[PDB]
Design a protein around this ligand. Structure first.
Ligand code: ZN
Ligand code: ZN
Lengths: 298, 307
């Protein structure tokens, strides 16, 4: 069922695990992801950037998310906005039935950031929708101050991690104890040796591709990281899969012949990382509080 | 809004133009088609095969079709089951909200086809859903006009696919039996449907062979042949292979031209655009452009009343 980020990450925080928030943009990405989480009876966060929503003209990504929800009742599924920039951005994503939004005013100075955010926190919680915000690396004491002022449900920390294709697990615990709320790890794609290889092997050019070792990410989960943002890994697994169909079967032209293998490569790539993140088997742990009931939380 | 096949084709016969039914399997293809028909303000038929529904686990395609309906409120959109095999198939289709279904029992002996067809026609009509059936590929042996008139009379199907020299796939073959098209159209008095109507454009086909592909010998139906047939009573043009090809070509192209590109949107986006570009010339030659705004679409509930 549609689950808020507060309850999902709250449960992950309690039993010391992370979930894994996967970015989606079309039908096959969602199917690939859902196939891995239902095989591992894992809760899941399906996340859409403003960019994804653009590419999907909004309504199509909105409907594919509903498809998922109905197809996999019983699986706790949170639909999350990812790098929202304005209040209008999250208001739009909340109108598409999202259960969580990220207001990224990180690039702003503290008090304007606190302000942008407080504004999204008011509109969101007034509807049960959870909020994630970012700060900065991250100064623990500012983390504590920020959360206390904004009231966000989850905090994206800067522990020396980035986008595309070690860290400060030292500051994570401090930030987790000082803040007392689930922390989010963006840029956590790993760039598996398998995904990068197949790609370069079938005509691609991504030589200098490296990411966050899974291990680093697990140590972070111990210190209080509850959400693991993954995006680049799904992409490369899709691309390498079709590059391969193209060279081993240049006569094939039906998109299902390559897009299908692509969808499968995401599942296979995600299966080990969900396992290691710790959420395998927890889908059935709790009854999902609706956005309406969730309003009472605030 | 959701439109029936009967109404949509009914309207194209009266003005002698053809609609053009495009097979869809996922998000990008449906966007590609919609971007063309809205730009041309044309009615459109979105077709989903049993394989397409299996590939989309049914619901995702259901949901993608609802987005299209809701995003483009004023474009008459017919949601159509292509090549259904069993009554259970059209039952499953109709329950996904389809407004039209083809029961293809054409490989069966007349009486058996008629039997198959009849049982589906009852189910659908008792709910407003249009029905298309087939009686009858390439250098054909063709379909007999007197038979067509007897099949229709006996089944009451809303449209009928006929064999006039056409065949599925990207390896079709030079001309069609337009002579048969005219007398079948007149005899039956109902909209005819043309299967295996992809043209395999020079444009789409070169791209593929230029960028790693291997579809050497590959031919389609000339678009002029379709305009002729359309003029003699064909109101539905099924196109599938062309979209597949358009998308495979543009993806093969970003791959070669930017081997460092790994985000699916960088090749699926163009693939979707190449599909829009390929359909525009096709649609205006079909004579459908600018007709989206003619009639007022009759719902299924109200369509029940025609039967
Ligand atoms: Zn991020
Ligand atoms: Zn066909």
């Amino acid at each position: 069922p549609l689950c808020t980020l507060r309850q999902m990450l709250g449960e992950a925080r309690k039993h010391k695990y992370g979930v894994g928030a996967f970015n989606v943009n079309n039908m096959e990405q969602i199917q690939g992801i859902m196939k891995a989480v239902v095989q591992l009876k894992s809760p899941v966060i399906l996340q859409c950037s403003r960019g994804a929503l653009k590419y999907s003209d909004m309504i199509y990504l909105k409907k594919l998310c509903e498809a998922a929800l109905e197809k996999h009742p019983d699986i706790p599924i949170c639909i999350h906005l990812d790098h929202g920039d304005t209040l209008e951005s999250v208001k739009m994503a909340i109108d598409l039935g999202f259960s969580s939004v990220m207001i990224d005013a990180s690039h702003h100075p503290f008090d304007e950031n606190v302000r942008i955010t407080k504004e999204v926190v008011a509109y969101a919680h007034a509807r049960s929708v959870s909020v994630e915000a970012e700060l900065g690396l991250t100064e623990p004491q500012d983390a504590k101050k920020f959360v206390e002022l904004t009231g966000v449900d989850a905090l994206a920390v800067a522990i020396g991690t980035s986008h595309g294709a070690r860290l400060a697990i030292d500051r994570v615990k401090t930030i987790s104890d000082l803040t007392g709320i689930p922390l989010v790890m963006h840029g956590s794609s790993s760039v598996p040796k398998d995904v990068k290889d197949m790609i370069n092997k079938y005509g691609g050019k991504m030589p200098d591709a490296v990411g966050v070792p899974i291990e680093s990410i697990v140590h972070a989960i111990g210190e209080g990281v509850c959400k693991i943002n993954v995006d680049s890994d799904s992409r490369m697994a899709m691309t390498g899969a079709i590059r391969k169909v193209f060279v081993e079967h240049p006569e094939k032209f039906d998109p299902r012949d390559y897009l299908g293998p692509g969808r499968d490569a995401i599942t296979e790539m995600l299966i080990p990382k969900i396992k290691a993140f710790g959420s395998a088997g927890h889908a059935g742990d709790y009854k999902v509080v609706s956005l309406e009931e969730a309003k009472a939380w605030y």
